[PDB]
Symmetry: C2
Subunit: 150 residues, 2 copies
């Protein structure tokens, strides 16, 4: 396209604003198709997963109440049941994860700590250009074109 004068811009920005209105409504129909699918899926499978619970439980009390004689891992053809040992490391009772860090740090244990550092671009903003230059940063100042539909 070639926009040779002010009327021809006016033109373009009516078309553009027609596309925005079209597109943005293509994207309403998709979110109705997707909305509907998520709703069918979850409609049909809520009762199946309710039933799977009852049964899952079911076998559970049975396998505990009968535990001592019965087991490792009893094969049931359709799959295995049984008991497994999972160790997890967790906070002590009244101790937050930040208190564990400060302790790791009081004791000098840096292997205990995971750090992710980042530059604070907002204390930066109120610096002069020279202070930025010393920390390896520059203000990039753009004059950019904007079409801005109503």
């Amino acid at each position: 396209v070639i926009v040779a004068d002010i009327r021809q811009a006016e033109g373009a920005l009516a078309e553009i604003a027609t596309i925005d209105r079209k597109v943005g409504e293509i994207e309403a129909q998709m979110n109705e198709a997707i909305d509907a699918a998520k709703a069918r899926a979850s409609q049909k499978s809520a009762p199946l997963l309710a039933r799977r619970k009852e049964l899952e439980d079911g076998v559970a009390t049975f396998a505990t109440l009968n535990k001592t004689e019965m087991f490792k891992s009893l094969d049931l053809g359709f799959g295995t049941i049984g008991f497994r040992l999972s160790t997890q490391i967790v906070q002590m009772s009244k101790i937050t994860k930040d208190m564990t860090l400060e302790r790791l740090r009081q004791f000098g244990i840096s292997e205990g700590i995971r750090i992710k550092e980042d530059v604070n671009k907002e204390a930066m903003q109120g610096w002069p250009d020279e202070r930025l230059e010393m920390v390896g940063l520059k203000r990039r100042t753009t004059d950019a074109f904007y079409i801005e539909i109503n």
Copy 2:
């Protein structure tokens, strides 16, 4: 449900494995409905957004080539066009964001730095219970029931 004997478990784990097979196929149909919607949406709007580009550009060269006389922000009824000043702070040319941090830190500027610390649960794992206790951590050891379909 009440699973009073080994045959009745066998029962349950055939049903369960039927649900898993049903559900997990409800969830294939949804991802075909959603797959299809994302594909219609993006089919109809690829040409509309191609056209929006041509026009967007279009007005752009026109507004630059004609810049000095023409502008702030010319109103076109359907919306505004023009030029705006956006300042952004960015890395200097051969300087990574980690070198800017180390510099911030060489100079003692802690306001420049954003930290997010975290406990390394993997150096933890090879600790005795007592070392954990001092940093406020405990090994929680669970014996859990597992039904595990084939």
